[PDB]
């Protein structure tokens, strides 16, 4: 990307935006790409703004205040431009205050007498033009500069909070939810930048209004005292309505946050939710809180209507309060009423528009500043000091607990030398991870000293994968090597299956490694830890998804031979690992039973324990069209009354002009939308949003997996978060306001033109010139905006991803790397945003300069060919001056509404997203022949020529090497992937049946468990069509009853996503309980014994096999002891399945990839008949 031309440019160029010319011209001809857009300017880059603000905050915190404030630190580095651009806004708006007099002098000097003055018109008219043009010359650069400042504020705050959250402690990290932290940023991103202009009026409006009322006080009469009182009542009425919005608006945002949290859950675990068949249920779950939300929006909109309507209706009321009282005292003045009128309106504008919008921001921003200040002042993580003098780890009397400092760990003692491996072991929730967390330095111990050498590696229990390549995750910062890398891949047994992929290496992985298998994520995450050089290695249960063979090989080659002379701590429950290892550690409820060698354990007493966009929008709701006709017809007859109404006065009455000023001044109220006229528009434009949301959610949730796995979570979520909240909240009032301003201006321009026709002559040429200039901007800008909104998604997806696997980032000390990566994703965004914002200012500035030509040629053409002896064509200068003052505000909306309307197309893409359009037999007979499955169309084959059969209600066993396709078979059976064959059930297939009914036949328990936010009632049965004792029966049946009884509100216990409330094993136990209640013939089981103890499986199988009495089951496990119960067996090979009756046949037919792998305990029972001859 070439450097930004803004730096290498003239002042005159940067002021008038001449540098923008090429990028517009290129955008006009052809379509733009992310390659085409410029680099960000060097002044407002990420690294400089962060380094700036942090210093002032550091010293402000370091000074030792009673309460450190962010404003005091912030103000010291942003005061200079704020006041400098602020001064221009004051002198700019102060221009208005002197308009009444200059306007008032020419209209005064119209009819004093015929002869005294000639020059007065032209001099003061040219002066009015000079004074007018001085304003927007003075005013426009201030806005741009002051916006651009707000961008520099927001980039610094995103940077410093990210730097903070990366070093935030684990005790407090669990308390803070991710959704609210993201949603805090997602709302502000755009709004906060643009909002500063309104906020600067907090001292402008009070200073101006006192000077304004001081000048209108030149009216001695109490008449003036009556006139101003109309502004005060309106002003308090405005702020009164803003109060009533508060409790409704505040209560709604909370109710929104529930939905955005739930949509994030359902769409992250989108693979599982389809397999059960929970579309309409989830749609219903979303529809309730959605139904509750819209009810409040109606009230927020209805109050926000009168907020707008009271402003437009007040022109009639305010104007009569000046003139009619003055009729009592020294009546019908020559020129004082016009001055008074102009002072009355400019005052009204300030109280109605500026000051509420000013105190709107300051009241909002202080709470934002309070929360960030609170967030920056939280518990900080301590980095481990590295020193070489210590060579082996030392613990003594370690006691520790989460959120209290009963204890999690209690008085641990262990003494490990260099070049030794320890074996941690125990039951569910014994505290095996917490011991690693204390050694790691994440959890701080309360009473007990813990000492070690600094550098540590760590492999997590739930392995996570970065967005990039397999190489990137294995290397993970460190440089590439020839045989180091290869020895790790060879040792970790990741070489064969990696070669089998379509691309050899460097496969671009989706969110969380969905394109990789369950076991591969463990081995790649292992390899990561193996590849680096460190003193201590912590492997927290790496062999949970691996086979017996791969485990055996990895344990012999990788753990023993390759890591020889490295200290290891491995979590496991296998006799052979415990036997080979040096020292054992047996936890139980946070306290240790035994600590020593294996023969010493045996000598002890416990022997062995274990228009297209608009037409589609309007046509979605026909009720809005029946309103749209009403607005056009009434406005036309409202116009008809004014056209005819003037002539009645003009005929009775050269000097038929001063009434035209009052009409133009009074126009807004005459052409306003009444109570019956305006409210139906707001009602219909809400109801459309309720449907338009409900259509999208249904369309997105029912689509094929190849299309869904193409898209990331953020790309989808960005439609729900921003674009839906835009069309919900903002669009109704802006689309209301747009019609008003067009009807007023177009209505007014026609009727002022009908009198004195040749004023129309000036407007014909440039209006079309203006419309061309708009179409010139809209081609390049609107297109550039869509790039900016896509550039928003990588920020939050990078933020939220960082919080999931933060524990590793700390272990590998890669925090600075992620900051650098985070700034790159910002700089690409701000480049786009800065460019777009500049191209808007070009158009906005060109709109004003274009206005000067209309004005002067209207002045030049409107002139006496003969002697204009009344003169004062200046009054036409005055009529044009005021009417087109609001035209800038009318245009200002035109860009906002149109650009914001293009967010609707993004929804319309998702609505039109490609999708798929007797008693079911007790006989659970299933056969498959010549099946072939593929994930991506026109890609590689995962299965090829698969053929097998299962007997009616028979127990079948599936085996195979890790990454053979055991899950993909279940995806093929359930139709989540492309297939070529004929799967049969009772001599029936999908020829007649739809997918819905085909899905209800099965009972799934997937690899990845899915437990969403809500109570256990909603988890165990989302429909809600079961008895309590029926739920208690299955809780006893599964072997999950007691652990529920220990909780408060036993069955209505608030269960969060992730967390620590239930252990991993319990999440499987829940996932089984789903399939109990499902009531299906066929059951698909993808590794039930994942994080289950040997003790739990025996008590499971005892009671579980009487529940599943009359139903077929398809198991797929690496553990043998759960598997050996079932009848038939089938193994998965390179291509296809080959079947066997018994284990004796299976293991002997298999070529010692399982026979020589199973331990002496199964070789006790297996060779019993041969050896016991
Ligand atoms: N990060 C955490 N924050 C707060 N509490 C936690 C955290 N991790 C675990 N806990 C709680 O403390 C207990 C410690 O058990 P822990 O999960 O360490 O045992 P474990 O052997 O790692 O579990 P598993 O057998 O599932 O691997 C858990 O039962 C849980 O309730
Ligand atoms: N979502 C996916 N998209 C594309 N390819 C996939 C996907 N999931 C798996 N694969 C491919 O299929 C192979 C293994 O499939 P699968 O995950 O069904 O095996 P598995 O038996 O479930 O693995 P494990 O035994 O580790 O659980 C891998 O080599 C992988 O490339
Ligand atoms: Mg654990
Ligand atoms: Mg699998």
Q: Is 271 in the pocket of ligand 2 (CB under 6 A)?
A: no
Position in ligand 1 atom list of the atom nearest CA 427: 25
Write out the E strands in 478-582.
536-539, 567-571
Q: Is 1017 in the pocket of ligand 1 (CB under 6 A)?
A: no
Instruction: Give the number of other CB atoms < 10 A from CB of residue 247.
Output: 11
402 is in an annotated binding site: yes
DSSP code string of 1066-1086: HHHHHHHHHHHHH--SEEEES
3-state secondary structure 832-889: HHHHHHHHHHHHHHHHHHHHHHHHHHHHHHCCCCCCCCCCCCHHHHHHHHHHCCCHHH
| 697 CB burial (10 A radius; 0-12, 13-18, 19+) | buried
What is the spatial distance between Cα 772 and Cα 709, in angstroms, rounded to a whole number? Answer: 42
Instruction: Give the number of other CB atoms < 10 A from CB of residue 92.
Output: 20
What is the spatial distance between Cα 30 and Cα 27, in angstroms, rounded to a whole number? Answer: 5
The contacts of residue 1123 (CB under 8 Å, 6+ apart) are 957, 959, 1115, 1117
What is the spatial distance between Cα 1080 and Cα 1101, in angstroms, rounded to a whole number? Answer: 19
Ligand 2 pocket mutation pick from 704, 932, 967, 1119 by most atoms within 8 angstroms of CB: 967
1079 is in an annotated binding site: no
Query: Whose C-alpha lies nearest to ligand 2, atom 27?
Result: 518
Q: Are 372 and 70 in contact (CB under 8 A)?
A: yes
Ligand 1 pocket mutation pick from 434, 540, 588, 1090 by most atoms within 8 angstroms of CB: 434
Q: Are 460 and 525 in contact (CB under 8 A)?
A: yes
Q: Are 1137 and 1131 in contact (CB under 8 A)?
A: yes
Q: Is 139 in the pocket of ligand 2 (CB under 6 A)?
A: no
What is the spatial distance between Cα 1138 and Cα 1127, in angstroms, rounded to a whole number? Answer: 15
Token representation of residue 746? 């177009």
**Residue the block writes with tokens 């550091």:** 58
Cα R_g (the chain), whole angstroms: 38
678 is in an annotated binding site: no
What is the spatial distance between Cα 154 and Cα 148, in angstroms, rounded to a whole number? Answer: 10
The contacts of residue 755 (CB under 8 Å, 6+ apart) are 646, 650, 656, 660
Q: Is 501 in the pocket of ligand 2 (CB under 6 A)?
A: yes
**Cα dihedral sign, 550-552-556-560:** positive
Residues in the chain, how many? 1173
Query: Whose C-alpha lies nearest to ligand 2, atom 30?
Result: 516
960 is in an annotated binding site: yes
Nearest alpha-carbon partner for 412 in 603, 588, 609: 588
Q: Is 348 in the pocket of ligand 1 (CB under 6 A)?
A: no
**CA–centroid distance, residue 1006 to ligand 4 (Å):** 8
Token representation of residue 272? 């599982």
The fold of the 394-603 domain, in CATH, is: Rossmann fold (3.40.50)
What is the spatial distance between Cα 1086 and Cα 960, in angstroms, rounded to a whole number? Answer: 12
Experimental method: cryo-EM
Q: Is 402 in the pocket of ligand 1 (CB under 6 A)?
A: yes
């Amino acid at each position: 990307m070439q450097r930004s031309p803004v730096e290498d440019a003239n002042c005159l160029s940067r002021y008038f935006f001449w540098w923008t010319n090429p990028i517009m011209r290129k955008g006009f001809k052809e379509k733009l790409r992310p390659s085409d857009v410029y680099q960000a300017p060097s002044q407002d880059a990420a690294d400089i703004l962060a380094e700036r603000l942090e210093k002032e905050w550091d010293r402000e915190v370091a000074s030792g205040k009673k309460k450190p404030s962010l404003l005091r630190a912030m103000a010291r580095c942003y005061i200079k431009p704020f006041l400098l651009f602020g001064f221009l806004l004051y002198i700019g708006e102060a221009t208005k205050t002197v308009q009444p007099q200059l306007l008032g002098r020419i209209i005064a000097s119209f009819d004093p007498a015929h002869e005294p003055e000639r020059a007065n018109g032209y001099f003061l008219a040219f002066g009015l033009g000079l004074l007018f043009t001085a304003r927007f010359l003075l005013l426009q650069p201030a806005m741009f500069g002051l916006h651009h400042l707000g961008m520099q504020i927001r980039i610094a705050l995103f940077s410093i909070i990210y730097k903070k959250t990366l070093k935030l402690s684990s005790r407090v990290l669990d308390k803070i939810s991710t959704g609210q932290l993201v949603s805090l940023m997602s709302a502000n991103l755009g709004k906060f930048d643009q909002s500063l202009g309104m906020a600067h009026f907090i001292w402008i409006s009070p200073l101006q209004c006192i000077l304004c009322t001081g000048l209108i006080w030149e009216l001695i009469d109490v008449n003036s005292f009556c006139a101003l009182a109309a502004i005060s009542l309106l002003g308090v009425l405005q702020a009164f309505l803003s109060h009533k919005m508060g409790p409704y608006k505040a209560q709604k945002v909370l109710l929104t946050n529930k939905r955005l949290a739930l949509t994030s859950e359902i769409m992250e675990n989108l693979h599982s939710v389809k397999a059960y068949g929970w579309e309409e249920i989830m749609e219903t779950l979303i529809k309730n809180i959605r139904q509750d939300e819209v009810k409040l929006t109606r009230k927020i909109g209805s109050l926000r209507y009168f907020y707008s309507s009271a402003y437009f209706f007040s022109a009639i009321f305010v104007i009569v309060a000046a003139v009619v009282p003055h009729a009592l005292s020294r009546g019908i003045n020559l020129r004082r009423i016009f001055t008074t009128l102009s002072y009355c309106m400019v005052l009204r504008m300030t109280v109605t528009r500026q000051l509420p919008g000013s105190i709107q921001m300051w009241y909002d921003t202080m709470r934002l500043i309070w929360k960030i200040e609170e967030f920056l002042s939280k518990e900080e993580y301590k980095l481990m000091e590295y020193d070489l003098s210590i060579t082996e780890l030392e613990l003594q009397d370690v006691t520790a607990s989460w959120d209290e400092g009963a204890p999690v760990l209690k008085d641990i003692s262990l003494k490990l030398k260099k070049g030794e491996m320890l074996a941690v072991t125990g039951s569910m929730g014994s505290g095996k991870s917490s011991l690693l967390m204390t050694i790691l330095g994440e959890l701080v111990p309360s009473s007990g000293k813990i000492r070690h050498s600094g550098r540590i590696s760590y492999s997590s229990q739930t392995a996570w994968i970065m967005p990039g390549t397999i190489r990137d995750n294995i290397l993970f910062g460190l440089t590439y090597d020839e045989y180091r890398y290869k020895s790790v891949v060879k040792a970790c047994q990741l070489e064969e299956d990696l070669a089998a992929l379509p691309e050899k290496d460097k496969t671009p992985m989706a969110e969380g490694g969905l394109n990789l298998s369950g076991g591969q994520k463990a081995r790649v995450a292992l390899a990561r830890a193996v590849y680096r050089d460190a003193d201590l290695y912590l492997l927290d249960a790496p062999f949970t998804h691996l086979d017996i063979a791969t485990e055996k090989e990895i344990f012999d080659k990788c753990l023993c031979k390759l890591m020889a002379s490295k200290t290891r701590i491995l979590v496991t429950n296998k006799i052979e690992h415990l036997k080979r290892a040096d020292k054992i550690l047996l936890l139980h409820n946070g306290e240790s039973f035994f600590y020593g060698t294996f023969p010493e354990l045996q000598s002890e007493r416990p022997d062995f324990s274990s228009w297209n966009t608009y037409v589609r929008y309007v046509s979605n709701n026909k009720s809005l069209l029946y309103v749209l006709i009403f607005i056009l017809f009434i406005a036309a007859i409202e116009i008809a009354g004014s056209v005819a109404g003037i002539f009645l006065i003009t005929d009775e009455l050269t000097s038929s002009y001063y009434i035209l000023y009052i009409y133009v001044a009074t126009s807004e109220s005459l052409l306003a939308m009444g109570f019956f006229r305006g409210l139906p528009f707001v009602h219909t434009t809400i109801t459309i949003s309720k449907k338009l949301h409900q259509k999208m959610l249904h369309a997105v949730l029912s689509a094929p997996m190849s299309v869904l796995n193409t898209m990331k979570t953020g790309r989808i979520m960005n439609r729900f978060t921003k674009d839906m909240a835009t069309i919900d909240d903002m669009l109704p009032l802006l689309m209301f306001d747009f019609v008003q301003l067009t009807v007023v201006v177009v209505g007014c321009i026609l009727v002022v033109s009908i009198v004195r026709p040749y004023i129309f002559l000036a407007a014909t040429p440039l209006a079309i010139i203006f419309i061309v200039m708009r179409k010139y901007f809209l081609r390049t800008g609107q297109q550039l905006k869509q790039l900016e909104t896509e550039a928003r998604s990588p920020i939050f997806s990078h933020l939220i991803m960082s919080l999931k696997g933060l524990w590793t980032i700390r272990a590998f000390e890669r925090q600075a790397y992620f900051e650098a990566l985070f700034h790159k994703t910002l700089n690409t965004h701000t480049a786009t945003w800065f460019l777009y914002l500049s191209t808007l200012r070009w158009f906005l500035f060109r709109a004003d300069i274009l206005f000067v030509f209309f004005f002067t040629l209207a002045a030049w053409i409107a002139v006496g060919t003969n002697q204009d002896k009344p003169g004062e064509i200046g009054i036409i200068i005055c009529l044009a001056m005021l009417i087109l003052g609001t035209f800038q505000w009318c245009v200002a909306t035109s860009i906002a509404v149109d650009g914001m309307m293009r967010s609707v197309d993004r929804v319309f893409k998702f609505i039109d997203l490609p999708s798929e359009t007797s008693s079911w037999p007790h006989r659970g007979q299933i056969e498959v022949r010549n099946l072939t499955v593929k994930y991506t169309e026109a890609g590689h084959a995962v299965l090829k020529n698969l053929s097998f059969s299962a007997e009616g209600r028979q127990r079948v066993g599936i085996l195979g090497r890790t990454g053979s396709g055991k899950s993909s078979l279940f995806n093929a059976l359930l139709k989540l992937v492309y297939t070529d064959g004929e799967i049969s059930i009772d001599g029936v297939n999908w020829n007649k049946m739809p997918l819905q009914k085909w899905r209800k036949a099965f009972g799934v328990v997937p690899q990845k468990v899915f437990i969403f936010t809500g109570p256990l009632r909603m988890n165990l049965d989302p429909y809600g069509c079961h008895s309590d004792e029926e739920l208690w029966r299955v809780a006893e049946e599964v072997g999950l009853k007691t652990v529920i009884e220990q909780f408060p509100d036993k069955l209505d216990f608030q269960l969060e996503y992730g967390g620590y409330v239930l252990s991993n094993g319990h999440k499987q136990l829940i996932c089984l309980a789903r399939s109990i209640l499902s009531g299906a013939r066929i059951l698909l089981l993808d590794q039930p014994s994942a994080h289950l103890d040997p003790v739990t499986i025996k008590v499971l199988k005892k009671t579980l096999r009487q529940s599943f009495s009359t139903c077929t089951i398809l198991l797929s496990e690496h553990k043998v002891e759960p598997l050996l119960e079932c009848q038939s067996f089938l193994m998965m090979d390179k291509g296809q399945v080959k079947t066997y009756d018994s284990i004796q046949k299976l293991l002997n037919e298999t070529s010692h990839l399982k026979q020589a792998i199973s331990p002496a305990e199964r070789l006790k029972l297996f060779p019993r008949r041969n050896s016991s001859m």
